[PDB]
Amino acid sequence: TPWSGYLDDVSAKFDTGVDNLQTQVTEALDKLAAKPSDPALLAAYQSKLSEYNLYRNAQSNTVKVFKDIDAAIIQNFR
Amino acid sequence: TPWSGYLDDVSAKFDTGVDNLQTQVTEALDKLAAKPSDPALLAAYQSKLSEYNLYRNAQSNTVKVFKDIDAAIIQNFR
Amino acid sequence: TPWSGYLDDVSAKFDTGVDNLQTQVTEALDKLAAKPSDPALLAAYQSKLSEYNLYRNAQSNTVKVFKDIDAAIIQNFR
Amino acid sequence: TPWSGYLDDVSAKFDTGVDNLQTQVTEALDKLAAKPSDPALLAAYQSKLSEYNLYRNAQSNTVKVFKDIDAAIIQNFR
Amino acid sequence: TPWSGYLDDVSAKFDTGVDNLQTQVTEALDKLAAKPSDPALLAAYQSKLSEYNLYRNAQSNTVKVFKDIDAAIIQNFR
Amino acid sequence: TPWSGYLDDVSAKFDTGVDNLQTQVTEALDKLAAKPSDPALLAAYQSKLSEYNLYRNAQSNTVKVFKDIDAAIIQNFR
Amino acid sequence: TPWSGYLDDVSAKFDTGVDNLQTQVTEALDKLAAKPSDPALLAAYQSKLSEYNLYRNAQSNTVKVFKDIDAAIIQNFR
Amino acid sequence: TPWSGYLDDVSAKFDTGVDNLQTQVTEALDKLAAKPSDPALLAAYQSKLSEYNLYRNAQSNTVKVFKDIDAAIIQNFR
Amino acid sequence: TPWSGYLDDVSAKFDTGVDNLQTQVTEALDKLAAKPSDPALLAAYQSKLSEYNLYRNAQSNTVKVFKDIDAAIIQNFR
Amino acid sequence: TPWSGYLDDVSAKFDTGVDNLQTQVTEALDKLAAKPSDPALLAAYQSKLSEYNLYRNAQSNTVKVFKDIDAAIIQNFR
Amino acid sequence: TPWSGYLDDVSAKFDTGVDNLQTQVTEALDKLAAKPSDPALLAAYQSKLSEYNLYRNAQSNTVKVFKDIDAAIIQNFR
Amino acid sequence: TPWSGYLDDVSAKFDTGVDNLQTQVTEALDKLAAKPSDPALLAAYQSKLSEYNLYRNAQSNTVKVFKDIDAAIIQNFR
Amino acid sequence: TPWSGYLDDVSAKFDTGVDNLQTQVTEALDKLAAKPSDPALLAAYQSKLSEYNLYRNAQSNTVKVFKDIDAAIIQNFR
Amino acid sequence: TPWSGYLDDVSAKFDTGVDNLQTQVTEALDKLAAKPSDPALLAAYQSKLSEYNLYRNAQSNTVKVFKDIDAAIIQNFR
Amino acid sequence: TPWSGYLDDVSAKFDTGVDNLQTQVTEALDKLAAKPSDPALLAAYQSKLSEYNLYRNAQSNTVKVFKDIDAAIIQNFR
Amino acid sequence: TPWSGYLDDVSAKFDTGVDNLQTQVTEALDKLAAKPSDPALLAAYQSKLSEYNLYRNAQSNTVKVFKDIDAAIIQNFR
Amino acid sequence: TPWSGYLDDVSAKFDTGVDNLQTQVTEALDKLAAKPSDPALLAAYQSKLSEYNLYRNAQSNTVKVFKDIDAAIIQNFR
Amino acid sequence: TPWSGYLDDVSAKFDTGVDNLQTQVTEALDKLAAKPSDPALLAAYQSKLSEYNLYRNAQSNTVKVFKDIDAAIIQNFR
């Protein structure tokens, strides 16, 4: 079993919270790259890519805050 | 069950809001391509295609706004 | 009763200040998705969506300022 | 009964002063990780996380001051 | 009473400024569709439709400007 | 008498510098909404609205600079 | 009568120096939360909030300096 | 005296530059509407209307450029 | 073997997704330049060129988004 | 050797694709100007001139599209 | 003699570099407003206005860069 | 005569070094607030405000350094 | 000597490139207005007017392109 | 020998990469200004000008990216 | 067997408490250096590196405190 | 053999992790500068340059973090 | 001979490392201010100004680091 | 042979432990000062300078500790 600290648990709640968004973006890209002119594939890939962008930004900026909550507590040990 | 975020729900409200506009445009194109000289088929395909254009533009520009509402909130985490 | 700090009160003043803007945007989207070609539904949804964008941006950037007012006071404890 | 000194009492006044902020941040993270694109979940998680940051900073910098009040009195015993 | 923000008030000044232009275009269309060969109905419907086009364009581009005035002020909070 | 700090004085110099631009835009909108097809009302409202846009942007970006001049001086107290 | 030391007097000179800035920010927030799209309410709340930020930072960093002037004198008793 | 900014002065240079073109178009329309078959009235109204079209287009596109010169300077304040 | 990062893989999925669209546009141009008056060559070159335009725009705007997803994560390292 | 970019190569494929259409139009004009009443010279010059018109329009509108494909890629560098 | 810092000297090099472009635009506007239908006045005013636009944009964006060169040096004093 | 220490002399060298920059910014603001659409007033106020920002930052960060040079010498008395 | 920027030089290359086309159109109009029934004057005025139309369109659309080349470079200063 | 940094080398690779495109555009303009009605000169000048536009845009946006690669490394020195 | 004092035991509790965080950071760096554009590798390396930073800071500041607890006891021997 | 510390090893893992990205960007620039109008060269250079940007940012921000991990340990020696 | 410490030598290595970049920026500004519409002068001034920005930032942030290396050694004298 | 005490041996273990870091920083500065815009020279100089900073801080804080170990033993002679 690999070790997971608290920032790993905060980061992996977004990983387990979305089910297969990492797959659905790669699947919708492979459908779009086969035919980049279908409106139904562009509108589906816009929605999946614009959610993967907000997924990664929320999952990164949350880890950045809890790292700043912790580093300001460890600063007060000494 | 495939995962659906909030931009998927906003995009699929237009998908479920129109019933079979994705079908009616493809059906009216197949009737028009068989006979591209009937005024009744041209006038019916003009109406269906000009609604599919506004369908896709509204469904795309709405996802683009809610992606900008969200990305300016996630910007304020840190 | 759930706990509410000062940034919750600042954030919920915008929530209680608008009455049902969270509802009126979802209602106007459901009317627009049923018929994305009516000018009266597009002009009503433009106004509601452009107010929900300014609602969320003002409600987020205000919380961000009061969080920076507070964190610069707590910095001066030690 | 576990022993609690004076710095434990100062630290646990913040723990008992907030009711369930340690829970509400973990609950709002679990709601946000399931859907990191809802503006209502981002705006609620911004407020809860920005209060948990000020909670921990005030609860840490207060313990640090009272530890410096005490260590400068114990310095004057000898 | 439904909530109305400032962009709703700017949009509804055009709605209340014209009296029944939303009705007069629908009435003139119903008179024209019954007989699309009368010059008096075509010349009356041209005038009503060409005013409804300028009505919607002015009512939309004004909301778009005041949304850009506001979003550049909210940008300067932080 | 309400209190006015230095950023209030900088903001209200633009308010007192224009005489009744806040009125002239609302007056020209009410004349335009009554008849959104007159070229003389559109050309007068374009000029008033394009000045109100530059009025608010200059009045906001100036307050933002003097707030950054001050916050970098208060940073140097400690 | 509650006791007030010298750092209370330095802190309350800023409290009595501004008249009702603690009120004017809460009043301007309540006007802005009712309508977060009025440029006149955003420009007035920007000025009041950007003064309350400099008010609290100056009132905190001044107390921090006089606490360091005093603690370096009390250090020289022994 | 009503206030006039710089875009008002640029717009009113076209207003004062033509003398009574706003009158001469309305006068030539009233002469043409009384008799829309005189070649001398049609040829005079063609010239006046085709100058009023270029008058309004030049007076509008000039205000639009100077509004873009200014907004790109105010962008560089911050 | 040349190195390929993740943006190379996203860009080359469009390259491998279309088979020989880079060839079919150059072949249809060489057939059209030999005879730019055949309707069958113009209608075939319109379809191929209008797909190569959407191919390059989708393949470029996708790389631009994933470059912005990544640069906002690398921003949060420090 | 003069330099030739990609738009030069696209433009010169039409130049090399037609053999001597730039010559055949000038030759057929010189034969027609010597005798502008021969039906065989008018019918031959109609065909050559109507092909030179479609030659230049296709050769110009193709360069215009590839210039818009490129400028939207260079837009995504930054 | 009025004081001139380095950003004044950078801004006034554009002012002294053009001779009377601030005059030539106002002169060409006064000639165009007297007759907004002369092609020779429109083509001369297009050239003067399109140079005044690039004059102000270059003169503003240069001051903005040297202000950012300086503010990043003054940041390194402390 | 008011007393002036060494940090007063360092701070007032910037005050006497600029002649009337405290006046020229207030004069250029009063000219800009009367007409916030003139490019010549915006470009002059950009230069004056961007110099007043660097004036105050250099005059503050220099006092902050000499206060740290001195406080580390007074630390070595005992 | 009047100042001439680069767009003046591009515009005046067309002015100096044609010799007296501005004169020859005015001369051919004065000959045609004296007798608007001579085929030799109509055929000469058709050729001169149809060249003055292409002269002004090429001289205007070239200035418009070089103004867009420049404004996209000045955009990249900051 | 004049000094050339890395952004000079990136900018001058486009300068040396095209041979005489700066000359060929000025030569094709001088041929077009002498006769702005020849289709062969318009079609040759369209190709040269549309390549000079993409030349300058690529040469500018590349320098802008490498300036942003460098400024984010120099940011990490301190 | 190497000797381990009490500060070694406090330091090695963090070493044995994390399992292979010293390995997982080096493994995630080697995966990221092979492809520094994958969002899944950047988001995984952000979490591992931000935990290794808090690991080392907590493991260092704890040893620093227990070294100060001990040195103030050994000071009281004599 | 040149000396390499730990930050050299962290920096050179990105150097050895990409194979010849420092070469492929310089090769793709030399191909693009020879012809800055080919869509295939622009789309290949966009991908290589957007990966070199993320390469340098990740390789710089990682060295910056490990320098801050180390400097906070060396701070705890004394 | 003026005295030069080690930070003077570090600062003047950038001064002697660039040859005449302080001159080439002032020369390119004087050429650009004479004609702020030439693309060749804008593209040359963009490259020189964007190198002078990185010159001053690297030359300032390096002096700032070596001043922090030294001040942390002089801190350890006592 | 110059005399070397124990603190000289502790200080010179860092001097002999790094091979030519005192040279590699001076060599990388001389390469960077010749061209302060190359990303490869900035990224190499960042790594060398950030190691020279940790080299000097570790080599200074170690001498400071062993000087405090010794001075507390010499204190116990009498």
Author numbering:
A (entry chain K), B (entry chain E), C (entry chain J), D (entry chain P), E (entry chain D), F (entry chain I), ...: 3 to 80
Show the paper's wording.
In contrast, and as previously reported for the cryo-EM structure of isolated filaments, our structure differs from the SSNMR structure of in vitro assembled filaments. Even the closest structure of all 10 SSNMR models reported shows a difference in the twist (63.35° in our model versus 64.00° in the SSNMR model), which although relatively minor, leads to accumulating differences that ultimately results in noticeable variance in subunit packing. Consequently, the overall fitting of the two structures is poor. The reasons for the observed differences between the cryo-EM and the SSNMR structures could be due to structural differences resulting from the different assembly mechanisms (i.e., in vitro versus in vivo) or differences strictly related to the methodologies utilized to determine the structures (i.e., cryo-EM versus SSNMR). To clarify this issue, we solved the cryo-EM structure of in vitro polymerized PrgI needle filaments. We found that the structures of in vitro polymerized needle filaments is virtually identical to the structure of in vivo assembled filaments attached to the base structure, exhibiting equivalent helical twist and rise. These results indicate that the differences between the cryo-EM structures of in vivo assembled filaments and the SSNMR structure of in vitro assembled needle filaments is due to differences in the experimental approaches utilized to solve the different structures rather than differences resulting from the assembly mechanisms.
Salmonella enterica serovar Typhimurium (S. Typhimurium), a gram-negative bacterium responsible for innumerable cases of acute gastroenteritis worldwide, utilizes two T3SSs, encoded within its pathogenicity islands 1 (SPI-1) and 2 (SPI-2), to invade cells and establish an intracellular replicative niche. The core component of this machine is the envelope-associated needle complex, which consists of a multiring base, an inner rod, and a needle filament extension that protrudes several nanometers from the bacterial surface. The entire structure is traversed by an approximately 2-nm channel that serves as a conduit for the T3SS protein substrates as they pass through the bacterial envelope. Furthermore, four residues at the end of the C-terminal α-helix, three charged (K66, D70, and R80) and one polar uncharged (Q77), form the lumen of the channel and create an electrostatic surface potential of alternating charges, which spiral upwardly about the needle, a feature that has been proposed to be important for substrate translocation.
